[PDB]
Design a binder for these strands. Structure first.
Ligand SMILES: [Mg+2]
Ligand SMILES: [Mg+2]
Ligand SMILES: [Mg+2]
Ligand SMILES: [Mg+2]
Length: 263
RNA sequence: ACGUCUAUUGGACCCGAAACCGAUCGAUCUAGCGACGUGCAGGUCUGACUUUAAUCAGGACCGAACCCGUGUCUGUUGCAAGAGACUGGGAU
């Protein structure tokens, strides 16, 4: 079944034989480097902490890391009409961002990066507040969003920004409205109670094609900063003992907010 | 008490381990990572863009610079405490 926005690489040689890549014609305005003041150039880490030893394994190498200042709260852009100039594709996240230009009355116009919902066309105007619309890309309080409409970029403690349901093609659903709790189904089929003063970016995150993508060769996934793994049974007993246990911290403070676990 | 001979504690007739415990120095060899910079002759095939036009992709192919070391032979206090010759593998 050919999806429209995927480049189906022809089997010319092994490696590009079973390779599927996302077309940048579906996202027509990705073209352009990251904005020169919304982005910096930070050194890559390689998986090593401040000591210098490896903490996370199988990481390192690849393209120069560029970091983008994505605004996950939209607190200081409340009540401001922001017209989306273009959509951008960052390699650091599964879902892609959306460049938004805000023109306030007393200040010169500026640009901000926010996560892109499914209904951004590089022409839409986004609005955030108590009185905002129900069209996708609006940030509303959990009280102002309906029951059963998909939402994303959810906060846990108000004023912190959006931390929940923000990967590619993911969304959360509000199913109940307890006065201070508001039971919400997180994308792992887990119900969590999120305070009503928290905010939800209404809509659904883009990059649904993320599941259908296929790096056909080791190099294309190695060039993303992923060094090769090694199986446990391929070693001597000193390195690994080769050749069903729940690991969440029990007696935590967040047991009170969850009704069912990740199903 | 002195002298001699044994005995015990001491390293205790002498020489000889593999060791164990601490805390110095070493990534100028080598393994990984990170920052900056540089290099890849000549051709061949396939796909795409634009064409009055001095553009891109493929862990593509043959092949020098370059990287590695498959087989055989030489060498074995050797030219070399791991080299040489000819075949080889990769070379956007
Ligand atoms: Mg005596
Ligand atoms: Mg040192
Ligand atoms: Mg050769
Ligand atoms: Mg050959």
């Amino acid at each position: 079944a050919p999806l429209p926005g995927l480049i189906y690489w022809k089997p010319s040689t092994p490696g590009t034989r079973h390779k599927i890549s996302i077309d940048y014609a579906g996202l027509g305005v990705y073209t352009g480097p990251p904005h020169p003041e919304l982005s910096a150039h930070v050194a890559k880490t390689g998986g090593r902490n401040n000591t210098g030893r490896i903490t996370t394994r199988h990481r390192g190498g690849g393209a120069p890391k560029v970091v983008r200042d994505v605004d996950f709260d939209r607190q200081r852009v409340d009540g401001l009409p922001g017209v989306v100039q273009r959509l951008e594709a960052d390699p650091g996240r599964s879902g892609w961002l959306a460049l938004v230009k805000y023109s306030p009355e007393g200040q010169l116009p500026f640009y901000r990066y926010h996560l892109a919902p499914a209904d951004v066309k590089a022409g839409d105007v986004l609005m955030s507040g108590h009185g905002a619309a129900i069209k996708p890309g609006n940030v509303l309080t959990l009280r102002d969003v309906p029951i059963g409409v998909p939402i994303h970029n959810i906060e846990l403690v108000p004023g912190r920004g959006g931390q929940l349901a923000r990967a590619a093609s993911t969304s959360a659903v509000v199913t109940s409205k307890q006065d201070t709790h508001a039971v919400v189904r997180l994308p792992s089929s887990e119900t969590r109670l999120i305070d009503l003063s928290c905010r939800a970016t209404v809509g659904q995150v883009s990059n649904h094609l993320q599941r259908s993508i296929n790096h056909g060769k080791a190099g294309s996934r190695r060039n993303l900063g992923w060094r090769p793994s090694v199986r446990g049974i391929a070693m001597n007993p000193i390195d690994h003992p080769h050749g069903g246990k729940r690991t969440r911290r029990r007696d935590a403070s967040s047991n009170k907010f969850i009704i069912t676990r990740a199903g």
